[PDB]
Design a protein around this nucleic acid. Structure first.
Ligand SMILES: Nc1nc2c(ncn2[C@@H]2O[C@H](COP(=O)(O)O)[C@@H](O)[C@H]2O)c(=O)[nH]1
Ligand SMILES: Nc1nc2c(ncn2[C@@H]2O[C@H](COP(=O)(O)O)[C@@H](O)[C@H]2O)c(=O)[nH]1
Ligand SMILES: [Mg+2]
Ligand SMILES: [Mg+2]
Ligand SMILES: [Mg+2]
Ligand SMILES: [Mg+2]
Ligand SMILES: [Mg+2]
Ligand SMILES: [Mg+2]
Ligand SMILES: [Mg+2]
Ligand SMILES: [Mg+2]
Ligand SMILES: [Mg+2]
Ligand SMILES: [Mg+2]
Ligand SMILES: [Mg+2]
Ligand SMILES: [Mg+2]
Ligand SMILES: [Mg+2]
Ligand SMILES: [Mg+2]
Ligand SMILES: [Mg+2]
Ligand SMILES: [Mg+2]
Ligand SMILES: [Mg+2]
Ligand SMILES: [Mg+2]
Ligand SMILES: [Mg+2]
Ligand SMILES: [Mg+2]
Ligand SMILES: [Mg+2]
Ligand SMILES: [Mg+2]
Ligand SMILES: [Mg+2]
Ligand SMILES: [Mg+2]
Ligand SMILES: [Mg+2]
Ligand SMILES: [Mg+2]
Ligand SMILES: [Mg+2]
Ligand SMILES: [Mg+2]
Ligand SMILES: [Mg+2]
Ligand SMILES: [Mg+2]
Ligand SMILES: [Mg+2]
Ligand SMILES: [Mg+2]
Ligand SMILES: [Mg+2]
Ligand SMILES: [Mg+2]
Ligand SMILES: [Mg+2]
Ligand SMILES: [Mg+2]
Ligand SMILES: [Mg+2]
Ligand SMILES: [Mg+2]
Ligand SMILES: [Mg+2]
Ligand SMILES: [Mg+2]
Ligand SMILES: [Mg+2]
Ligand SMILES: [Mg+2]
Ligand SMILES: [Mg+2]
Ligand SMILES: [Mg+2]
Ligand SMILES: [Mg+2]
Ligand SMILES: [Mg+2]
Ligand SMILES: [Mg+2]
Ligand SMILES: [Mg+2]
Ligand SMILES: [Mg+2]
Ligand SMILES: [Mg+2]
Ligand SMILES: [Mg+2]
Ligand SMILES: [Mg+2]
Ligand SMILES: [Mg+2]
Ligand SMILES: [Mg+2]
Ligand SMILES: [Mg+2]
Ligand SMILES: [Mg+2]
Ligand SMILES: [Mg+2]
Ligand SMILES: [Mg+2]
Ligand SMILES: [Mg+2]
Ligand SMILES: [Mg+2]
Ligand SMILES: [Mg+2]
Ligand SMILES: [Mg+2]
Ligand SMILES: [Mg+2]
Ligand SMILES: [Mg+2]
Ligand SMILES: [Mg+2]
Ligand SMILES: [Mg+2]
Ligand SMILES: [Mg+2]
Ligand SMILES: [Mg+2]
Ligand SMILES: [Mg+2]
Ligand SMILES: [Mg+2]
Ligand SMILES: [Mg+2]
Ligand SMILES: [Mg+2]
Ligand SMILES: [Mg+2]
Ligand SMILES: [Mg+2]
Ligand SMILES: [Mg+2]
Ligand SMILES: [Mg+2]
Ligand SMILES: [Mg+2]
Ligand SMILES: [Mg+2]
Ligand SMILES: [Mg+2]
Ligand SMILES: [Mg+2]
Ligand SMILES: [Mg+2]
Ligand SMILES: [Mg+2]
Ligand SMILES: [Mg+2]
Ligand SMILES: [Mg+2]
Ligand SMILES: [Mg+2]
Ligand SMILES: [Mg+2]
Ligand SMILES: [Mg+2]
Ligand SMILES: [Mg+2]
Ligand SMILES: [Mg+2]
Ligand SMILES: [Mg+2]
Ligand SMILES: [Mg+2]
Ligand SMILES: [Mg+2]
Ligand SMILES: [Mg+2]
Ligand SMILES: [Mg+2]
Ligand SMILES: [Mg+2]
Ligand SMILES: [Mg+2]
Ligand SMILES: [Mg+2]
Ligand SMILES: [Mg+2]
Ligand SMILES: [Mg+2]
Ligand SMILES: [Mg+2]
Ligand SMILES: [Mg+2]
Ligand SMILES: [Mg+2]
Ligand SMILES: [Mg+2]
Ligand SMILES: [Mg+2]
Ligand SMILES: [Mg+2]
Ligand SMILES: [Mg+2]
Ligand SMILES: [Mg+2]
Ligand SMILES: [Mg+2]
Ligand SMILES: [Mg+2]
Ligand SMILES: [Mg+2]
Ligand SMILES: [Mg+2]
Ligand SMILES: [Mg+2]
Ligand SMILES: [Mg+2]
Ligand SMILES: [Mg+2]
Ligand SMILES: [Mg+2]
Ligand SMILES: [Mg+2]
Ligand SMILES: [Mg+2]
Ligand SMILES: [Mg+2]
Ligand SMILES: [Mg+2]
Ligand SMILES: [Mg+2]
Ligand SMILES: [Mg+2]
Ligand SMILES: [Mg+2]
Ligand SMILES: [Mg+2]
Ligand SMILES: [Mg+2]
Ligand SMILES: [Mg+2]
Ligand SMILES: [Mg+2]
Ligand SMILES: [Mg+2]
Ligand SMILES: [Mg+2]
Ligand SMILES: [Mg+2]
Ligand SMILES: [Mg+2]
Ligand SMILES: [Mg+2]
Ligand SMILES: [Mg+2]
Ligand SMILES: [Mg+2]
Ligand SMILES: [Mg+2]
Ligand SMILES: [Mg+2]
Ligand SMILES: [Mg+2]
Ligand SMILES: [Mg+2]
Ligand SMILES: [Mg+2]
Ligand SMILES: [Mg+2]
Ligand SMILES: [Mg+2]
Ligand SMILES: [Mg+2]
Ligand SMILES: [Mg+2]
Ligand SMILES: [Mg+2]
Ligand SMILES: [Mg+2]
Ligand SMILES: [Mg+2]
Ligand SMILES: [Mg+2]
Ligand SMILES: [Mg+2]
Ligand SMILES: [Mg+2]
Ligand SMILES: [Mg+2]
Ligand SMILES: [Mg+2]
Ligand SMILES: [Mg+2]
Ligand SMILES: [Mg+2]
Lengths: 61, 38, 94
RNA sequence: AAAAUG
RNA sequence: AGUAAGGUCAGCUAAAUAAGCUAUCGGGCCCAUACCCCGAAAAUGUUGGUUAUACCCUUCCCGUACUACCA
RNA sequence: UCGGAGUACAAAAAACCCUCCGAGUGAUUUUAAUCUAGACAAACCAGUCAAAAUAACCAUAACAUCACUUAUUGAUCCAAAAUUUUGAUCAACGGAACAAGUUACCCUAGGGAUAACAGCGCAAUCCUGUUCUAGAGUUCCUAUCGACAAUAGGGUUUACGACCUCGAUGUUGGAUCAGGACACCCAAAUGGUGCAACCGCUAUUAAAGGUUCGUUUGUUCAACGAUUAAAGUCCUACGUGAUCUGAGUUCAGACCGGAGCAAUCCAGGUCGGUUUCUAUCUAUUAUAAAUUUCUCCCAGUACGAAAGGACAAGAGAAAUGGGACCAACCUCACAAACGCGUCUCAGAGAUAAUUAAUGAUUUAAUCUUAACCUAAUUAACUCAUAAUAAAUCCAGCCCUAGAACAGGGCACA
RNA sequence: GUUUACCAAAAACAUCACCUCUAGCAUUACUAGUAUUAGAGGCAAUGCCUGCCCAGUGACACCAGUUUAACGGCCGCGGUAUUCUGACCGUGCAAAGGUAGCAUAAUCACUUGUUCUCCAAAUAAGGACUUGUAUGAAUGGCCACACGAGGGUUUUACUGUCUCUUACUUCCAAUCAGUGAAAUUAACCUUCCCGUGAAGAGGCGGGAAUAAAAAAAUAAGACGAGAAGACCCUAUGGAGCUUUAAUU
RNA sequence: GAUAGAAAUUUUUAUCCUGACGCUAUAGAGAUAGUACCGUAAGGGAAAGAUGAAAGAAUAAAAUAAAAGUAAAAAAAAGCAAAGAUUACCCCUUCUACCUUUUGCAUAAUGGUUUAACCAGAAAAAAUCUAACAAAGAGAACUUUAGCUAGAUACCCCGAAACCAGACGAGCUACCCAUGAGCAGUUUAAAAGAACCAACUCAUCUAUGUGGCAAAAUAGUGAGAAGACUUGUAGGUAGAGGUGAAAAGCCUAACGAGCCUGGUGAUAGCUGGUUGUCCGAGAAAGAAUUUUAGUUCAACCUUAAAAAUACCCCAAAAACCCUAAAUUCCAAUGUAUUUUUAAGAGAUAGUCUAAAAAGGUACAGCUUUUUAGAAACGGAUACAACCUUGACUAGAGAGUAAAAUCUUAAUACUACCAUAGUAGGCCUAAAAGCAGCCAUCAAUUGAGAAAGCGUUAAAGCUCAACAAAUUCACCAACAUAAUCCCAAAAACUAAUAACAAACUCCUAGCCCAAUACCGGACUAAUCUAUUGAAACAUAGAAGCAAUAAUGUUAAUAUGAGUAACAAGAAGCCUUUCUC
C-alpha cells in the first residue's frame, strides 16, 4: 500500500514471513514461550507467527 | 555472446558439427565374426 | 506448443537442427578434393634457388607498358571536321 | 563567613 | 545498500609539552563516615608505511547518524 | 588532468562506473648556451630526440643528478614586467572573463536512441522432481524426513537486459463472463505404512463438474465467525474499463510531522477531485443422452484388552446444474409473463495407475516394450437412444409465432 | 459568509476578539479625518494560558545596547535505591536545553503499538497507557454551548441496495414515409490453430476451414477512434516562483 | 571572439530611341472588395466570369462526353489481389503494400480516402573545363617568377512554446463609485449578520447527457432566503499592470499572465517533406568538443592530373624469469596497384556469427576492447547476421553448389547345505561371530574367533567351505503449463542416383547489383534568337517535372440512406372534444 503509481500497482513489493513456532527447533524453548506470550497478537490460531514488511520499495529490502 | 567455457554445453556452429560428424570414430570391422569362427 | 526461446539461431538455446548424410558426404568429397590439392602441391618443379629471378624481364616490361599507358593519358585532338560538321544540320534542298 | 550523617 | 563524523586512563573534555576534573588505592583531619588536605598508579580500539612532532593516510572489529526519490 | 602494471602473452594502437599503484613535488651542485642536418610520435595544437659547427672550463665530459623517473602540469586574449619575464584546484584540467534552487501551475521540439505497466531473452532469486547416504525416527537411510553435495526441468515473485511501442500498449482491487494447464482441495480407482478399526502421513492415475456466506482494511494478501465434500496453485496484457465501478494510486485545492532561509519536496499519512465512442472488418449469437451430499438398515457387525468403530450392497430425502411449465400460493387493476411455486434428468464399449490365472527366453518361478484368450478395474471419449426430418397455394385477417423477414391457423361454431 | 466561471465548496480564506509594529499631520486617496485615530501585518469569538533564549539573520539604534504575540531554536556520555527504572551524581557544550497541556493524533517508518467497550466476528469507532528522541503553547497549546450540503462510528424505522430479481407503461428500440451529419478510411477478394518474425500475425511458414449476399444483437481482437504522452529523458529550447546564484 | 568598418584622394556627357526571353481567374494586387463574414474593439478577411456577328436568333445551334464519385452491369471457396500463363474470368504455382526513421519495419513504428491545381537547392573566394591575349592581361583604379580576362560548373520548404514595442479591451468576470428596485407567508418583546419555507440567489450528491438541449445543460435532491443579501442603468481601475474574504482566482469561451499589429520569412544540433530516365564508382566510426541527438580534423571514398613502384612476401632480424594462435620488415614470384597534386562532400547514434578477454550469474536477442565474415531473388519449412554464390539483357537449353525425416529408447540370476575346542582373551549388569580393544589359532576332504539380519544378553535366519552342476552375466534406464497435436506418410527393385541458384557453359547481344555522398550522357513541358509552319532543329533562359510534408484550396467518395428531427383527435375546414 501507498503512493507509487503504476509501480506500486503492478509490483509485488510487500513481504510476509510466516512460520510455525511450536515446531521451530532453531529457537530455544524459553525464548519460544516468551515470544508466544508477548507477541500473541501477531500469532493466529494455528500457531503460525506472521511478520510483514511494507516500508521499503524493494522486495529484497 | 557467451564465454569460451559455459555450463550449457555451448551448442556448436554448424560447420564444426559437420566436422565432428565426419571425424567420428569408425571401429575396424572384420569380414567374419570370430566368436564361432573356428 | 514447443517454442524456441529468443531467435532461432542466435540465443543460448538454439534449434537442435542436426547434420545429414548428404552434408557428411559433401564434406568428405571436399576433403578428398583438398587432399588431392595438397598432394599436387608437394613436389615443385624448380627449387627456390633455381627460380631466383627466372622471370624478371617480362615483369619489368609489363610494368613499363603499364607506365607508358598511364602516361599516355591526355586529351584528344580537336579537328576542323568536328566544328564544321555542325553546319550541316541546316542542309536544305534548293 | 563555612560546616552533613550516626 | 551509500555518504559524514568517529573509537582516550575505570567515566567525561581536550592536544601531541599526552593534560583538566571524577572514580581507585595509601595516609591525615574526625569519636566513626562524608567534605576537605597530601602521594601514586591510571591510555590514542587494532595492521602498515612515514615524519623534527604527531592531531598523515590505510587494514581488522565496534557503536553510530542522514539518504534510498519520479514513476 | 598526467604516469606505471594486467586486461592488450610476441612491431604499434586499442575501451568499460575493469583490478591495483601513484602525481598537482622535494633535496643537492656539475646552474645545465647558440645554431642546425636527419628522425619518433601525432587529426590539429602540442610533445620528443639529435649528428656536424661555434662561446667558457679538463686542454679527454658536460644528457644537471636522486627519490620504481615515467607523471610532477594549462592554449589564446588580457593584465602586471620594462628589453625580458611572470600571472589561474581556468582540477568541468583543449580552459565561456564573471551566472544558484524549485516547478504536482507548467509549456514547446523530439525519443521506445531512454525509465515506470504489459510483452520478450536469462534464470541470480523462486518452484519442482529424481541421484547420493551420514543422521533423526526405541533396533532400522528411504512409513514420514533427511545436512554437506549432483543432474535436469518450469517460467508465478523480485532483480538483470533495454528489443516492440512515448504523432498513447489506459494503470490495482472488485461486479459480469469466464478459456486453459495439472504441479489435484473434493469427488473416483489403487500402493506403502511406525495401516488392528475411525481419524491419519505419503506415492500413482484421473481435469467431464464444483470449489460458500460475513466483520475490519481501497485493498490483492491478512486476522476472525459460521459452514461445507472443498473453500487448490497458476497462465490468460499476473484475463476482462469501445461492458461497469473509482476506494487507493496518478494533476491542479488544503492540513499535520520532517528537510530546505525561501520557492518547494514525501514507497509519510488525511479530506475532495469530468472514466468519451453512433460497431467498418474479423469472431460469435441454444440438440440432449447429470453430479454431489444427508438419513434407515447393513451393525454397535467386521476389526479390538475396552474405550472406539468399518467398507461394500440396497432404500429413500434433498442441493447444484441442464431442459421445461402455471393446477394451486405469490408478484399480478390484460386473457399473459414471472419465482418464492411445480415436473424430469439415463443404458453399452472403452481405458490410466493397480491386482491375480496360464506360460518360455531363464523346461523352477515371473501379470507378458513374449504370444493366445484372460478376469476386478477412475474420470473422460464415442455409440445405442432421443429431437428436426411430408419441397414449389400463399392476397388479406388472427396467433400462446415474431425486431423486419419468417412460422402456425381462417369448414364445423 | 467567501473561494479554484468550466473535474476540487473544504479541515482552505475571511470573521468578531487578542496582539504587534508605522505615522504629531491640510486642501483630489488616507481625509474634508488627528493616536479611543489612520495604515502595514500575525493568530482567530469566548474560558485556562501563552514557559526559556538576542547565540546566529533581520528591524530600531547610524558603534555598544533593545527586540522573539520577529525570522526561529529550546542537549549529550556514564554509573547509580533491591533485579524493571533512576529520585541522585561526575563531566562537556550551549542562548536556552521542550515548561504547562495534549497524545498512536490529519502528526515519517516500525503500526493492525498494548488494553477495555461496541459486533458472533472490526486494520473501522470511542475511552485509557505512553519519549511524540520528528507533539508542543498567537507559523498559538488545551477543553466547552450553538453551528457545518466538511470528514469518520452506532441504535432503531425504512426500503429492489442485496438474497434473487419480476411485472406494467413513457422515452428508447424494430418496420413504413420525408429530410439527412460525425470522428475514421493506404489498398483489401478483410478465417481458425501452432510455429516463426522489430521479441503479442487476417496477409510468412506447416496444416484445417471455405456457395455468395442481406437484416437484428455482444464487444474478444484490428497492439480500435479521439489528443505530434500531461508520467520519464534529451534540448548548451522557454516561462512562473524563491534566494545565501552571477552582473547591476 | 562573432563581427563592424571609414576617410584623405579619384571616375561619372545634354534629349528621344520604354517597354517586357513578367502572369492569365488555385497565376498576377487581398480585390469583381477591404465588400460580405468573423470579432465589443484594435484587427483579420475570401470564393466567385466563360455560347455566339446577332439571345430585338431560348419549338435556341455547334464542339469533349476524357479526372476522382455513380449508373449502364451487386457477388460465387483461396487470400497486399499481381505475375507466369492458359482453349478458358477464377480455379494451379510464386512474391510479408509504398515513403520516412532505424543495426534491423509487413510489422501491431510514422504519413496518406480519392482526383485536380499549387508546394521544397539560391550565392563563384580558392579550383576544373572552354576560349582571347600572353611576360603581360583587363574598355580607368588591380593582378602578374605563365600569368590576366571572359563564360559554364554552388550551397531547400514547413513547424513552436517564447522576447520586445505600440495599439484595443472592466457590455463576461474581480473590486469600487453614483442612481434606483426587490424579499410574500409563519414562530418570535425583534428587521436578532435567530428559526421554517416561498419569489429570488448559489450549486452538495446522484442519474442522464459526453459532436449533447447546452464549447458546462436537464431531472431528482440540496444551502442561504431583512443581509458581509440579490439585482437594473451609468462610470472607473489595462498587462513590467488592474483586481483579488490567496483559488497563483478573474481581466470577453485556451491567463503561472489578455488579444491584435509590427520586429517576423524570430530561431530551432529537434520532427516531417523534398518532384524525369539511364550509366560508373561507392563509405559503419581514431581524436577533441557544456560533447557524445551536433560539429571540426585524421583514416576511408568520388571526379580529374602527375609519376613509380604497390599487395603475396623465402631466408636473416625484433628482451630481459614461462609463455599459444601468430604479428612487423623485406627478396623472388603471381597480379596492377600504389603514392603524391588540386577539388571535395557524406559518415563519426550499428547488429549478429566464429575467435581472444573483461564485467555480470563460467545469465541473457546483455555491455565494453582486438581479428575475420555477412546482411540472395538459392538452402536452414517461415528467418538479418548461418551455408552455397566474381549480382547486365533475351531463350519454352544444359552442367553443378549449399541442401530434405538426427541417434539410441537397454539392467532376471534360482539350486546345495551347514557340525567342533569356544562364552578365544579384557572392561561392562550382560558383550556367546557381532557397544568396544588384542590375537585371528586349530578338528572333519570340507566351515572366517565370523562378511550381512536379529536378542537387553542369548537363541535363531543368511553368506562364503565341501560334496551337484556347470548359456551369458562390470557400470550404464530420470515428470511436467497453460486457445488446438501438428505436413501426410514410409524399415529393401540396385544411389558417389536424380531433383536443385544472381554460379558456370550454350545461342545472340546494347557485355555485370546496391543506401549517404560524388561524376557523366540524355530528356518531359514553357519563353526568346534564328529554321519550320500537319508542330520541329541548333542555341540562350529559368516560377524547368510531385505516389507522400497529421501539406493549402475546390469537388467528391466510406462511415450511411446510418445516428438524429417533427404535426393531439374527429370534422360540416376551422367547428367541437382530450390534456
Ligand atoms: N589571473 C589570470 N586572469 C586572466 C588570465 N586571462 C584572462 N584572465 C581574466 O582576467 C580577469 C582578472 O581579474 P581578477 O580575477 O584578477 O580580478 C579575470 O576575468 C580572468 O578570468 C590569466 O592568464 N590569468
Ligand atoms: N556509416 C555508414 N552507414 C551506412 C553505410 N552503409 C549504409 N549505411 C547506413 O545504413 C542505413 C541503410 O541500410 P542499408 O540500406 O545500407 O542496408 C542508412 O542509415 C545508411 O546511412 C556505411 O558504409 N557507413
Ligand atoms: Mg493507503
Ligand atoms: Mg500521496
Ligand atoms: Mg509521490
Ligand atoms: Mg515488475
Ligand atoms: Mg564472444
Ligand atoms: Mg521467437
Ligand atoms: Mg535463441
Ligand atoms: Mg544520609
Ligand atoms: Mg610516423
Ligand atoms: Mg655536438
Ligand atoms: Mg568541458
Ligand atoms: Mg574537456
Ligand atoms: Mg589530450
Ligand atoms: Mg498541491
Ligand atoms: Mg508536449
Ligand atoms: Mg528500446
Ligand atoms: Mg543506441
Ligand atoms: Mg525494472
Ligand atoms: Mg519490463
Ligand atoms: Mg506487446
Ligand atoms: Mg538475468
Ligand atoms: Mg532453465
Ligand atoms: Mg540414527
Ligand atoms: Mg545496446
Ligand atoms: Mg509508450
Ligand atoms: Mg497510430
Ligand atoms: Mg500509434
Ligand atoms: Mg487496446
Ligand atoms: Mg473456467
Ligand atoms: Mg497427475
Ligand atoms: Mg480424493
Ligand atoms: Mg476445473
Ligand atoms: Mg496492462
Ligand atoms: Mg508481472
Ligand atoms: Mg508471464
Ligand atoms: Mg488487468
Ligand atoms: Mg480494471
Ligand atoms: Mg466507457
Ligand atoms: Mg477492453
Ligand atoms: Mg478518488
Ligand atoms: Mg491541531
Ligand atoms: Mg505525498
Ligand atoms: Mg483520498
Ligand atoms: Mg464533497
Ligand atoms: Mg453489425
Ligand atoms: Mg453498444
Ligand atoms: Mg462402547
Ligand atoms: Mg454404506
Ligand atoms: Mg432445477
Ligand atoms: Mg514354467
Ligand atoms: Mg504367484
Ligand atoms: Mg448417436
Ligand atoms: Mg404458413
Ligand atoms: Mg470576492
Ligand atoms: Mg462562485
Ligand atoms: Mg470547479
Ligand atoms: Mg459548502
Ligand atoms: Mg463543486
Ligand atoms: Mg482560518
Ligand atoms: Mg487577553
Ligand atoms: Mg484561541
Ligand atoms: Mg512564545
Ligand atoms: Mg538579535
Ligand atoms: Mg545583540
Ligand atoms: Mg492524557
Ligand atoms: Mg485533541
Ligand atoms: Mg481526543
Ligand atoms: Mg505515525
Ligand atoms: Mg476509514
Ligand atoms: Mg462498515
Ligand atoms: Mg481503532
Ligand atoms: Mg484513540
Ligand atoms: Mg518540533
Ligand atoms: Mg508545529
Ligand atoms: Mg514563530
Ligand atoms: Mg493559519
Ligand atoms: Mg459545510
Ligand atoms: Mg455534522
Ligand atoms: Mg456555510
Ligand atoms: Mg412481478
Ligand atoms: Mg427512414
Ligand atoms: Mg484524416
Ligand atoms: Mg472472404
Ligand atoms: Mg522480415
Ligand atoms: Mg515495429
Ligand atoms: Mg503468433
Ligand atoms: Mg497462413
Ligand atoms: Mg500456407
Ligand atoms: Mg495436420
Ligand atoms: Mg471488440
Ligand atoms: Mg493489420
Ligand atoms: Mg488507439
Ligand atoms: Mg511526442
Ligand atoms: Mg500524460
Ligand atoms: Mg514534469
Ligand atoms: Mg549539449
Ligand atoms: Mg537556454
Ligand atoms: Mg534565448
Ligand atoms: Mg550573492
Ligand atoms: Mg569565445
Ligand atoms: Mg485571385
Ligand atoms: Mg470518370
Ligand atoms: Mg489465388
Ligand atoms: Mg528525413
Ligand atoms: Mg529501435
Ligand atoms: Mg542511419
Ligand atoms: Mg512488431
Ligand atoms: Mg503501419
Ligand atoms: Mg516517432
Ligand atoms: Mg512519412
Ligand atoms: Mg493515418
Ligand atoms: Mg572565381
Ligand atoms: Mg533576451
Ligand atoms: Mg466601464
Ligand atoms: Mg460593469
Ligand atoms: Mg420575510
Ligand atoms: Mg436567518
Ligand atoms: Mg438542476
Ligand atoms: Mg426518482
Ligand atoms: Mg433552507
Ligand atoms: Mg440555517
Ligand atoms: Mg519577465
Ligand atoms: Mg500583479
Ligand atoms: Mg495557497
Ligand atoms: Mg499552489
Ligand atoms: Mg481568451
Ligand atoms: Mg526555421
Ligand atoms: Mg545535439
Ligand atoms: Mg555500380
Ligand atoms: Mg553497408
Ligand atoms: Mg620471413
Ligand atoms: Mg616488398
Ligand atoms: Mg571532409
Ligand atoms: Mg554522432
Ligand atoms: Mg548487442
Ligand atoms: Mg568488423
Ligand atoms: Mg523465401
Ligand atoms: Mg557473387
Ligand atoms: Mg580342517
Ligand atoms: Mg553357501
Ligand atoms: Mg508427477
Ligand atoms: Mg538448374
Ligand atoms: Mg555470353
Ligand atoms: Mg553473371
Ligand atoms: Mg534546348
Ligand atoms: Mg517548380
Ligand atoms: Mg498531382
Ligand atoms: Mg499531399
Ligand atoms: Mg449515401
Ligand atoms: Mg451501422
Ligand atoms: Mg432513430
Ligand atoms: Mg408533437
Amino acid at each position: 500500500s501507498g503512493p507509487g503509481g503504476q509501480n506500486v500497482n503492478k509490483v509485488n513489493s510487500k513481504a510476509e514471513v510466516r512460520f510455525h513456532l511450536a515446531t521451530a527447533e532453531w529457537i530455544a524453548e524459553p525464548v519460544r514461550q516468551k515470544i508466544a506470550i508477548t507477541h500473541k497478537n501477531k500469532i493466529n490460531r494455528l500457531g503460525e507467527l506472521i511478520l510483514t514488511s511494507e516500508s521499503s520499495r524493494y522486495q529484497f529490502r | 555472446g557467451s564465454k569460451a567455457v559455459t555450463r550449457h554445453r555451448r551448442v556448436m556452429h554448424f560447420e564444426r558439427q559437420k566436422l565432428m560428424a565426419v571425424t567420428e570414430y569408425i571401429p575396424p570391422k572384420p569380414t567374419i565374426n570370430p566368436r564361432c569362427l573356428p | 506448443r514447443n517454442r524456441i526461446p529468443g531467435r532461432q539461431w542466435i540465443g543460448k538455446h538454439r534449434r537442435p537442427r542436426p547434420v545429414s548424410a548428404q552434408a557428411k558426404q559433401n564434406m568428405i568429397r571436399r576433403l578428398e578434393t583438398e587432399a588431392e590439392n595438397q598432394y599436387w602441391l608437394s613436389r615443385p618443379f624448380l627449387t627456390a634457388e633455381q627460380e631466383r629471378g627466372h622471370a624478371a624481364v617480362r615483369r619489368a616490361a609489363a610494368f613499363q607498358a603499364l607506365k607508358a599507358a598511364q602516361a599516355a593519358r591526355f586529351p584528344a585532338h580537336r579537328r576542323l571536321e568536328e566544328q564544321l560538321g555542325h553546319l550541316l544540320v541546316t542542309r536544305k534542298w534548293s
